[PDB]
Each structure stands twice: as structure tokens, then as C-alpha cells.
């Protein structure tokens, strides 16, 4: 149904996210897939960059919400 489809969409939209993390994120947004994906992308980048969560958000914005591009940026030496 809708809820299964939504959890799958979240999990497939964010590299590295588990099914459990997708469910938790979507529960926190009341089933709003777009907000769950945003929050999970920030989370993933935050854990990869060990920056502040607001700085991870700012990097994601600079990369036009592309987590792959933002992640390659934070990992570049
Ligand atoms: Cl996003
Ligand atoms: Cl590059
Ligand atoms: Mg389960």
C-alpha cells in the first residue's frame, strides 16, 4: 500500500539508509516522504563530514540537494 511504497521510496532515495532508519524518519514527518528524505540526507552527510548538522544542511544546499556530490566534496582532501 501507500505506506510500504513510501518507506521504500525513502530507503531508495538516500544512500546508506536502513529500512529501520527510513521508517523512523517517515514516522517523524507523519508520512511526508520529501521531508523524511531531506532529514535523512542531512543525517548521512552530517555523519560522513562530522561537521555541525546545520553545516551539513548548508553543504547539501550548495550541492543542490545532491547527496552524492556533497559527500564527494566533504571527502575530498
Ligand atoms: Cl532533499
Ligand atoms: Cl569533483
Ligand atoms: Mg520492519
Amino acid at each position: 500500500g501507500e505506506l510500504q511504497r513510501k518507506i521504500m521510496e525513502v530507503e531508495l532515495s538516500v544512500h546508506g539508509v536502513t529500512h529501520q532508519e527510513a521508517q523512523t524518519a517517515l514516522g517523524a514527518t507523519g508520512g511526508d516522504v520529501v521531508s523524511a528524505i531531506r532529514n535523512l540526507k542531512v543525517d548521512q552527510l552530517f555523519h560522513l563530514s562530522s561537521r555541525s548538522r546545520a553545516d551539513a544542511w548548508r553543504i547539501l544546499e550548495h550541492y543542490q540537494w545532491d547527496l552524492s556530490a556533497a559527500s564527494r566534496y566533504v571527502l575530498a582532501r
Side-chain angles (χ1 to χ4, degrees), residues 3-49 51-77:
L3 188 67
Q4 188 268 344
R5 182 250 313 160
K6 282 186 187 175
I7 300 164
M8 170 153 81
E9 169 139 71
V10 170
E11 199 185 332
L12 298 169
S13 296
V14 187
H15 176 271
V17 164
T18 67
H19 187 256
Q20 180 63 209
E21 291 168 333
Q23 293 186 266
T24 291
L26 201 61
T29 68
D32 175 355
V33 174
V34 170
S35 291
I37 289 171
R38 170 65 57 80
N39 293 338
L40 291 163
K41 287 183 179 175
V42 173
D43 300 328
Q44 288 299 280
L45 187 60
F46 170 59
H47 296 330
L48 187 72
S49 71
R51 259 189 204 62
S52 85
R53 186 175 306 278
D55 293 317
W57 185 96
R58 174 76 197 90
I59 292 161
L60 191 61
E61 183 189 43
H62 179 74
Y63 286 96
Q64 302 181 130
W65 314 100
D66 184 332
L67 178 62
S68 175
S71 292
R72 287 161 47 80
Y73 162 74
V74 303
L75 294 175
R77 315 263 312 257

